[PDB]
Structure 1
Amino acid sequence: DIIIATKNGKVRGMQLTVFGGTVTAFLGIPYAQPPLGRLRFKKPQSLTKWSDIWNATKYANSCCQNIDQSFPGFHGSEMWNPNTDLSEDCLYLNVWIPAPKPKNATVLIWIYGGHFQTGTSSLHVYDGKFLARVERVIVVSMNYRVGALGFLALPGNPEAPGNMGLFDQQLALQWVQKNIAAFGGNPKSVTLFGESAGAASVSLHLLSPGSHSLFTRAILQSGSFNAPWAVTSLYEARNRTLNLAKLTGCSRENETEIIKCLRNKDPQEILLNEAFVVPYGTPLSVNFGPTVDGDFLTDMPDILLELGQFKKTQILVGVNKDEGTAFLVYGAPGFSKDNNSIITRKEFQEGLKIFFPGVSEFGKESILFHYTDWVDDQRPENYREALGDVVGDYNFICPALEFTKKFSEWGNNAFFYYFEHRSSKLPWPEWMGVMHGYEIEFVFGLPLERRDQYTKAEEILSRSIVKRWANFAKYGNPQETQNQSTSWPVFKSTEQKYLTLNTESTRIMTKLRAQQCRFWTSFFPKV
């Protein structure tokens, strides 16, 4: 029996057996007032003290969200759907600490992805008990609001000011500053980490002044806020808040009148309508996401990036070999998870129409020109490969590389990885390769579980990644120092050295996707 006193009162946890040792888990500790009734669409409010032992022994409600029903019964997609009840009452977090209870441990805070429309901290690939066991770090994760309920904006107006889900994340980091020493943690040694929209979130806490003093360092897996999907213009945002009003028969215009109508509606009506606020979405659409609120984010983030206005610290940034493939089966024609997806020239062009909705004719021809100069044979999968690369280069890889240069140019150490191992348990077919999201199980150490189907060589890659992640958090330097490992060079623009992660031979390489990113980064923003 094992109870900790927080600022807001006592919480009970639970013992877990992990690799012949013990971890203590506190699952579902509340961190804010439930954001219901008159509090829907507002910033999170702070929590009233309980006298009580609060029982943190089960994961808590996930936030309201639309669910991926594209492949029912398929583990490939359904492993990302929420695994606790949905509810607006979802502002809760989890703490895993090692046993014996540590003295002054480094803290890792996980922020999940989901395009800001989906996701939850309770997924099995985000279970932190392995990291606590193996590296003796403390792992913390939180639920934050997603979709309209989390990012609806009517700028300047505090009834719906934008960026509520980012303030959710912030308020949680605050909770770690105030409460983590009670659990054996070091509030002075906190590393944020996250994937996709979670990574874009980490990148925005690097830019948000209110977050500067709530963490030490940061890790960005497949995401950064300069990705074309990550920030909503102030224009698109009102158009969407207004379209949502129309769709729910909530058009008014004492704009507070609109928000108040929207608070009478119930979560389903709001969720059902979200998809239609844009005239043409894509498989990558973020209907409601971060905005320039003048609060969390004081200016357009590209400008802050370019002019060096962000926390000065080390970053670790990376991407997967086949970032784009996963999205091709949510609407590109001729693609299927159940065949090899050899597509034609004609299918490739329509594919571009799906991903680059408007996007001028010339813009679309540019892409096909850059990416279909074949070397050479034909090579029947040529066009299938090009479309994946187009989607992955534009959306993930080039914005990650551009973030990394701009950041490091202001004098901080940066480390860049290219993740190239395909999980032997991947349920998606082989043409999809090293997909978006499939480094995560490696970072959280699931292959360290022997009972669990992974190869020996996969165990070793996970053990090595776990070590490097932890050394980065504790010491700002992602080396594996004992097993004669390849030394991870810092990223400098000029050299642009990065490390490859794979089971066979890890390598130091230079200028990832050089020719492709020149195109995305210098020419494409013009069209």
Structure 2
Amino acid sequence: DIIIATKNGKVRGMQLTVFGGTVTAFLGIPYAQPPLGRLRFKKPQSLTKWSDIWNATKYANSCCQNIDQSFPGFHGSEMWNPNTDLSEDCLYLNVWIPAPKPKNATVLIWIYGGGFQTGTSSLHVYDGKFLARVERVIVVSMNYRVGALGFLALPGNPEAPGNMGLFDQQLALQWVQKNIAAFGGNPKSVTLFGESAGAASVSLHLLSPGSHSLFTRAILQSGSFNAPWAVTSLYEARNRTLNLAKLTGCSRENETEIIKCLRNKDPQEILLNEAFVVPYGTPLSVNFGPTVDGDFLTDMPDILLELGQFKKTQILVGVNKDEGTAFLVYGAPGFSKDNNSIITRKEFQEGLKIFFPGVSEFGKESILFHYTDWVDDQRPEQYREALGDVVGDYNFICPALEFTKKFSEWGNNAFFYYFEHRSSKLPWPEWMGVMHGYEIEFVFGLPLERRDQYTKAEEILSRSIVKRWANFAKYGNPQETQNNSTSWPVFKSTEQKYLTLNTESTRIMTKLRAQQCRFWTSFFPKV
């Protein structure tokens, strides 16, 4: 019976057998007051404190959110869907600790993605027990509010100030600072890591002064705040809040009355109307996301980045070879996970309309122009791949690369990776390639489980990635020093070296997507 005394009371964990060893898991520890009733849309409130023992022996409720119903019965989509009951009462976290209890272990804190609209820490691919077992780090993950319930903004108004889900995360980091030493952890060696919106969140914690003292360094997988889906403008945020009020019959004159009316609506009515606060959504639509609130975010984050206003520390940043492909089957014409998705020029053009709704004709043409000068054989998969690269480069790769350059210009060591391995177990079709989100299971060491039907090469790759991540967290340097591995050089804005991650030849390369990113970063913002 493993009981840990926290600042708020006792918690009971459970023993897990992992790899002929033991891990102690505490699943579903509360870290805030349930944000119900008058607390909906408000910042998370501190916890009351309890006598008796809290049983942290099962995952807690996931936060309210719309579920992906595009492919019912299909494991490729459904593996991302919540695997616990949805509730507003969802502010809980998980802790995995090595057995026997470590003395001063580095802590890795996971922040899930899901476009700030979806996600939960209880997903199978986020199971921290392997990292705990293999590297003897402590792994922490938390649920945070998503969608309108987490990011509804009426700027300056504390009844709905925006960024609630980010403050949820922040309160969790705080919990780690105050409690993790009791679990055998070192609060002075905390590394945040997250993927997609989780990665954007991480990058925002690097920018928020309230988060400065709550962590040591950061790992950003397929995401950063400067991605075009990551930050909602104040103009948009108010138009969307008002549109939601209209849909729910909560339109008032007094802005506080609106929020009070929204506070009486059932979560389903809010969730059902979130989709329509925008006239034209994209498959990457972030209806309710981070805003410049003047609290968590003191200024427009591009300005803070440009002018060196962020936590000075090491970062590890990276992206996957085919970031954009997954999004094409959620709207783009001619695309399907059930055929090779050979699309014509006209279908490509229509595709741009879907992914670039408010963009001028000239703007769409310029994308077409940059991505359609073939080299040079008229392969039929020409437009199919171009559209994937368009969506991937614009939304993920180029912003990640720009973030890394800007951050490193202020003197901090940065390491950049390019993930190129397609899972042998991928349920999605071959044309989709090395997909968005499919490095995660390697980071969390799923292929170390020899039962799971991954190949031997995949076990080796995962083991190496796990070691590099752990060394980064512990020592700020993502080397694998024992097995004649390729040394990972720092990324400087000059040479721009990056490391390829694959099952065969691990290589040092330079200037990822140089041509494409000049288009997106320099030219396209003017459009």
Instruction: Give the TM-score taking structure 1 as reference length.
Output: 1.00
Residue 526 of structure 1: SS of its match in structure 2? coil
Structure 1 residue 452, shift from structure 2 partner: 0.7
Structure 1 residue 15, shift from structure 2 partner: 0.2
Residues in 2 aligned to 1:525 and 1:515: alpha-carbon distance in whole angstroms:
16
Give the structure 1 partner of residue 34 of structure 2.
34
Residues in 2 aligned to 1:353 and 1:258: alpha-carbon distance in whole angstroms:
34
Residues in 2 aligned to 1:298 and 1:160: alpha-carbon distance in whole angstroms:
17
- Post-superposition CA distance 1:420-453 (Å, at most 9, x none): 0000000000000000000000000000000110
Residue 520 of structure 2: SS of its match in structure 1? helix
Residue 479 of structure 2: SS of its match in structure 1? coil
Residues in 1 aligned to 2:368 and 2:49: alpha-carbon distance in whole angstroms:
59
Residue 218 of structure 2: SS of its match in structure 1? strand
- Post-superposition CA distance 1:286-343 (Å, at most 9, x none): 0000000000000000000000000000000000000000000000000000000000
- Post-superposition CA distance 1:320-370 (Å, at most 9, x none): 000000000000000000000000000000000000001000000000000
Residue 291 of structure 2: SS of its match in structure 1? coil
Residues in 2 aligned to 1:469 and 1:299: alpha-carbon distance in whole angstroms:
31
Unaligned runs of 5+ in 1: none
Residues in 2 aligned to 1:213 and 1:462: alpha-carbon distance in whole angstroms:
31
- Post-superposition CA distance 1:363-421 (Å, at most 9, x none): 00000000000111111100000000000000000000000000000000000000000
- Post-superposition CA distance 1:452-488 (Å, at most 9, x none): 1000000000000000000000000000000000000
Give the structure 2 partner of residue 245 of structure 1.
245
Q: Which stretch shows the higher mean deviation, 374-383 or 465-474?
A: 374-383
Structure 1 residue 41, shift from structure 2 partner: 0.2
Give the structure 2 partner of residue 20 of structure 1.
20
- Post-superposition CA distance 1:108-159 (Å, at most 9, x none): 0000000000000000000000000000000000000000000000000000
Residues in 1 aligned to 2:516 and 2:77: alpha-carbon distance in whole angstroms:
29
Residue 477 of structure 1: SS of its match in structure 2? coil
Instruction: Give the TM-score taking structure 2 as reference length.
Output: 1.00
Residues in 2 aligned to 1:106 and 1:376: alpha-carbon distance in whole angstroms:
51
Residues in 2 aligned to 1:521 and 1:452: alpha-carbon distance in whole angstroms:
41
Residue pairs, 1:104-253, within 5 angstroms: 104-253=104-253
Residue 512 of structure 1: SS of its match in structure 2? coil
Residues in 1 aligned to 2:272 and 2:512: alpha-carbon distance in whole angstroms:
40
Structure 1 residue 52, shift from structure 2 partner: 1.0
Structure 1 residue 87, shift from structure 2 partner: 0.2
2:66 maps to 1:66: yes
Residue 86 of structure 2: SS of its match in structure 1? coil
Residue 370 of structure 1: SS of its match in structure 2? helix
Residue 175 of structure 2: SS of its match in structure 1? helix
Question: RMSD of the alignment, in Å?
Answer: 0.2
Residue 421 of structure 2: SS of its match in structure 1? coil
Instruction: Report sequence identity in percent.
Output: 99
Residue pairs, 1:454-465, within 5 angstroms: 454-465=454-465
Residues in 1 aligned to 2:420 and 2:147: alpha-carbon distance in whole angstroms:
31
- Post-superposition CA distance 1:153-177 (Å, at most 9, x none): 0000000000000000000000000
Give the structure 1 partner of residue 256 of structure 2.
256
Residues in 2 aligned to 1:238 and 1:332: alpha-carbon distance in whole angstroms:
29
Residues in 1 aligned to 2:36 and 2:112: alpha-carbon distance in whole angstroms:
23
Residues in 1 aligned to 2:323 and 2:178: alpha-carbon distance in whole angstroms:
37
Structure 1 residue 270, shift from structure 2 partner: 0.1
Structure 1 residue 97, shift from structure 2 partner: 0.1
Residues in 1 aligned to 2:343 and 2:503: alpha-carbon distance in whole angstroms:
31
Residues in 1 aligned to 2:128 and 2:477: alpha-carbon distance in whole angstroms:
21
Residues in 1 aligned to 2:235 and 2:515: alpha-carbon distance in whole angstroms:
33
- Post-superposition CA distance 1:168-213 (Å, at most 9, x none): 0000000000000000000000000000000000000000000000
Structure 1 residue 75, shift from structure 2 partner: 0.1
Structure 1 residue 43, shift from structure 2 partner: 0.1
Residues in 2 aligned to 1:190 and 1:438: alpha-carbon distance in whole angstroms:
24
Residues in 1 aligned to 2:273 and 2:35: alpha-carbon distance in whole angstroms:
20
Structure 1 residue 253, shift from structure 2 partner: 1.5
Residue 16 of structure 2: SS of its match in structure 1? strand
- Post-superposition CA distance 1:37-61 (Å, at most 9, x none): 0000000000011001000000000
Residues in 2 aligned to 1:176 and 1:192: alpha-carbon distance in whole angstroms:
12
Residues in 2 aligned to 1:217 and 1:296: alpha-carbon distance in whole angstroms:
18
Which structure 1 residue ranges, 4+ long, deviate > 6 Å from structure 2?
A: none
Structure 1 residue 240, shift from structure 2 partner: 0.3
Residue pairs, 1:255-274, within 5 angstroms: 255-274=255-274
Residues in 2 aligned to 1:513 and 1:81: alpha-carbon distance in whole angstroms:
32
Residues in 1 aligned to 2:491 and 2:46: alpha-carbon distance in whole angstroms:
40
Residues in 1 aligned to 2:208 and 2:474: alpha-carbon distance in whole angstroms:
23
Give the structure 2 partner of residue 414 of structure 1.
414
Residue 87 of structure 2: SS of its match in structure 1? coil
Residues in 1 aligned to 2:281 and 2:380: alpha-carbon distance in whole angstroms:
29
Residues in 1 aligned to 2:361 and 2:105: alpha-carbon distance in whole angstroms:
55
Residue 326 of structure 1: SS of its match in structure 2? helix
Structure 1 residue 80, shift from structure 2 partner: 0.2
Residues in 2 aligned to 1:288 and 1:52: alpha-carbon distance in whole angstroms:
38
Residue 62 of structure 2: SS of its match in structure 1? coil
Residue 348 of structure 1: SS of its match in structure 2? helix
Structure 1 residue 234, shift from structure 2 partner: 0.3
Structure 1 residue 233, shift from structure 2 partner: 0.3
- Post-superposition CA distance 1:4-40 (Å, at most 9, x none): 0000000000000000000000000000000000000
